[PDB]
């Protein structure tokens, strides 16, 4: 099947903390118990590296992690979208320098 | 006259925000009224 | 016998009605909440 | 004067339609994780 | 002893962390929608 990019927007799901959703599956796979009782990236590197020839880093944090959100425009309905990568030192990115917005002017 | 036009549409749908309001703050009902029931098999069983 | 099964029932009719009790509470968070986004469907039909 | 910003709320209020549409395109999807595998616990 | 209250110290636990899941399922699931409370409000806010 293809990659279509367009369902990584359309498929309602996104990020969580999932602290709470560790605790609310452990005391939900005991249940369950008490009843019964190198990576695959680095292969990648070499995918790319036989492919192209070279490193690339434009296509290094095409392997790592990618959130490709949408959002609107308030002038003209349009759509657009926000993007983070892990690697980026910019907003989202799993990489950040302290400090980072707080979305409280937003909720007050 | 695009001052008629622009205020009959926001205040028509901002009934129709009212009549989404009225419908989603009606979400907040639902489980306090669901596990309000299931809430009661706790400490006995 | 009813000294080992007695209480089981306590056990066994708690374990067959949450089945019930929670499959109750999907169709009525699924005969709720899609009524909202219908409703903003009609918003779009205005604006 | 008033026209160009009683349009320009309105694109965003439009805008803030889908805005929340897709932050309220969670609403029957918080349900499911929440129940579904609870219930053959009980079985 | 350890062969019939052992076979429903599997069986109490069991219903006991059942029920105690959907208090916390009241709890995360609508202060998710407490804010499409209040940014569906605040749609009309901008007007």
Redesign the interface.
């Known amino acids: 099947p293809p990659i279509s990019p367009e369902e990584q927007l359309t498929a309602?799901?996104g990020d969580t903390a999932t602290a709470?959703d560790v605790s609310?599956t452990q005391?939900?796979?005991?249940?369950?118990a008490?009843?019964q009782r190198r990576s695959l990236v680095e292969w990648l590197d070499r995918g790319w590296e036989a492919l192209a020839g070279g490193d690339r880093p434009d296509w290094l944090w095409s392997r790592r992690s990618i959130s490709v959100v949408?959002?609107?425009?308030?002038?003209?309905?349009?759509?657009f979208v926000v993007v983070s990568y892990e690697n980026s030192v910019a907003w989202g990115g799993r990489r950040a320098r302290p400090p980072r917005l707080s979305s409280e002017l937003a909720?007050a | 006259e695009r001052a008629a036009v622009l205020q009959a549409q926001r205040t028509a749908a901002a009934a129709a925000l009212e009549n989404a309001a009225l419908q989603a703050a009606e979400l907040p009902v639902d489980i306090e009224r669901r596990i309000r029931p299931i809430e009661q098999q706790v400490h006995h069983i | 016998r009813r000294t080992g099964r007695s209480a089981l029932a306590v056990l066994i009719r708690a374990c067959r009605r949450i089945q019930q009790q929670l499959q109750r509470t999907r169709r009525a968070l699924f005969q709720r909440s899609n009524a909202v986004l219908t409703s903003l469907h009609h918003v779009r039909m205005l604006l």
Do not use: M
Request: no cysteine; net charge negative; hydrophobic share 25%.
């Open positions: 309602p799901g709470e609310i005391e939900n796979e005991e249940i369950l008490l009843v949408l959002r609107h425009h308030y002038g003209t309905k349009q759509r909720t």
